[PDB]
Each structure stands twice: as structure tokens, then as C-alpha cells.
Amino acid sequence: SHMINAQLLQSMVDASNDGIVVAEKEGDDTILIYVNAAFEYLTGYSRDEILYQDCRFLQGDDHDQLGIARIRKAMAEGRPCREVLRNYRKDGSAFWNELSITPVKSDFDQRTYFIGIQKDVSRQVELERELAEL
Amino acid sequence: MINAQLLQSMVDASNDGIVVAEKEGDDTILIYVNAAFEYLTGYSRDEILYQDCRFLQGDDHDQLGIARIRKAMAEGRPCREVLRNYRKDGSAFWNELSITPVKSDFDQRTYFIGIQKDVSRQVELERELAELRA
Ligand SMILES: Cc1cc2nc3c(=O)[nH]c(=O)nc-3n(C[C@H](O)[C@H](O)[C@H](O)COP(=O)(O)O)c2cc1C
Ligand SMILES: Cc1cc2nc3c(=O)[nH]c(=O)nc-3n(C[C@H](O)[C@H](O)[C@H](O)COP(=O)(O)O)c2cc1C
């Protein structure tokens, strides 16, 4: 009587300020099958551009970031993980992405999907460094 | 095809508190809260459901943002305000609150999505850094 319906679930995901994505594993890729508006705003990429691609384009030229090894191992072991990564928007600007990945098993196909949540921590990091200097 | 199970998992994974409230008269009472909201406020889902979120203001009221929230809600505008809020144990924190009115043709009920996050540290840093800058 008083409880939410499924359209409300979509509304909560749409209202989120952090990016929220769903990806599915294929071989060495985990390809984006859903992104919310905040992900497009945060990354500068449109939904049409980046769907069915692995999120690693957000690392740009940066690789062998330690968090990436931790993510790969957590993915292999079926465990959730959280890493702060250097990421880059479509225009090339850098941001610090606090990224969480949660595997969830879909009852429909009994397939494991991966929920990402991207939070821009750049301002908090830079301000922490500035105050450390001060 | 993102089903309701996956949408729910996306809400459950959110770092930020996420709630749904429905308006009855001058109350908007909580009909859903996620785990991040419970951890942020220290209240369990069973304690706070079907109550207006204003209990989080505690002894405080007449904060300027509250007046802005009221006007924005009456006008159906989304809004964002940083409010002083209080946990179950009484501890104070700065809550960046984003309220989004839900537009739905399906049911007559008017709903609001709240998104809450603890900005206390960023506020502390901002004031300290501004003072030291002088
Ligand atoms: C659901 C999901 C979301 C992801 N989001 C990001 C992201 O926003 N930024 C990023 O740098 N990596 C993200 N990744 C990690 C990469 O997609 C990839 O798994 C990681 O770089 C390790 O794979 P690789 O060594 O083959 O590049 C995400 C991974 C998953 C599964
Ligand atoms: C969906 C939603 C979530 C809200 N969350 C909070 C909150 O977390 N903390 C808070 O102090 N007020 C929150 N509010 C605002 C109060 O519920 C209330 O609308 C505000 O105090 C102004 O109403 P009032 O002047 O009648 O007290 C929320 C409102 C809505 C609609």
C-alpha cells in the first residue's frame, strides 16, 4: 500500500549523483549494458558511444595502476571491490574515481552481472593535499 | 533489459543514502530507505519508516535551506541543500540532500527521491582552508 514499485527503482537510479552502470563479462572484457545519466555527466561520454564497451577506456593512457590488479583479482574471485583510480573524461580532463564493483547473480538467467558505482572524489583529494600543504 | 532485481541491487550498492518519500499534506513520509541511509543516520529501516525526514534536523529548525527546500517542493523543483543533521546517537553531521520530485503518469501518488551524503569533512576542510587563506 505504502511501498515503492519498480518504476520507483528506476527513478532512484536516475536520481543518483554517482555514476551507476551494469556490465556483463565476455572473456577479458566486461561490457557496459547500462549507464545512468550521472555516468554520462561524470565521464563526458554519451550512452550511445560507450555501450557494450569495457570501462577501461576511462583509464586512458594510464595503466598498471595498482587498483586495476586488485580489481582484476576481485573480479576473478567473485568478490566486491572498491578502488580509487585515475580516470579521464572524453575531453581528456583527469578525475579521481572512487569505483565500487559488486557482482550480483540475476535470477532470470542465473548469470553474474557487475554493478559499478563511480563517485568523483577529485575535489576531496585535492583539498586534502592543499590543507596538508597549509 | 535491466530488470527490477538488478535495479534493486543498484540501489542497494549505492554509497549515498537513497530514500523514497510520499507526500500526505505537509508531511512527506519515508516509504523506502537503503542500507547506506541506515548507516548514515544510525537508524534502522524499521524505526524510521512512514515518518517525515525532518526528525533528522532534531533540535534544529529554521535553517535557511529548509525554507528553500519547502519552496522547491511546492514548486515541483528538484533542489540540493546542505543541512545540519543528527544521527540516532545524537552526533551531528553535514548532510548534502538532493530531492527530486517523481513524475509518473501511472499512479496518482506524489513521490520524492531523497539522496543523502555526509559532506561533513568537506565542510570542515572548506572552512579551515578559507580561514588559513584569509
Ligand atoms: C561494472 C564495472 C564498472 C567499471 N567501471 C570502471 C570505471 O568507471 N573506471 C575504470 O577505470 N575502470 C572501471 N572498471 C574496470 C575495468 O573495466 C576493468 O575491469 C579493469 O581495468 C581490469 O581489466 P583489464 O586489466 O583487462 O583492463 C569497471 C569494471 C566493471 C566490471
Ligand atoms: C524525499 C525527501 C528526503 C528528505 N531527506 C531529508 C534529510 O535527509 N534530512 C533533512 O533534514 N530533511 C530531509 N527532507 C526534508 C524534510 O522532510 C522536510 O521536507 C523539510 O524539513 C521541510 O519541511 P518542513 O518545513 O515542513 O519541516 C527530505 C525531504 C524529502 C521529500
Numbering used by the authors:
A (entry chain A): -1 to 132
B (entry chain C): 1 to 134
From the paper:
We recently reported both, dark and fully-adapted light state crystal structures of a short LOV protein PpSB1 possessing core domain flanked by N- and C-terminal helices. A direct comparison of the two structures revealed large structural differences such as ~29° rotation between the two protein chains in the dimer, an altered dimer interface and ~11 Å movement of the C-terminus in Jα helices. Substitution of the Arg66 to an isoleucine in PpSB1-LOV was reported to accelerate the dark recovery by a factor of 100 to τREC = 23 ± 1 min in comparison to the wild-type protein (τREC = 2471 ± 22 min). The faster dark recovery of the mutant protein is presumably due to the loss of the salt bridge between Arg66 and the phosphate moiety of the FMN chromophore that was previously observed in the wild-type crystal structure (inset). Additionally, the dark state crystal structure of the double mutant PpSB1-LOV-R61H/R66I (where an additional arginine 61 was replaced by histidine residue) is essentially same as the wild-type PpSB1-LOV. The overall structure of the mutant and the wild type is similar with the a root-mean-square-distance (rmsd) of ~0.68 Å for equivalent Cα atom pairs for all residues in the two dimers. Each protein chain of the dimer is bound to an FMN cofactor shown as stick models (colored by element: carbon, yellow; nitrogen, blue; oxygen, red; phosphorus, pink). The N- and C-terminal residues are structurally disordered and were not included in the final model in the PpSB1-LOV crystal structures (N-terminal 20 amino acids, C-terminal 8–9 amino acids). Larger structural flexibility and conformational heterogeneity of the end regions is observed for PpSB1-LOV-R66I dark-state solution structure as compared to light-state solution structure. Consistency of the global changes observed in solution in the current study using SAXS with those observed in the respective crystal structures further supports the signaling mechanism in PpSB1-LOV proteins, where rotation of two protein chains relative to each other causes large movements in the C-terminal Jα helices, relaying the light-activated signal to the associated effector domains.
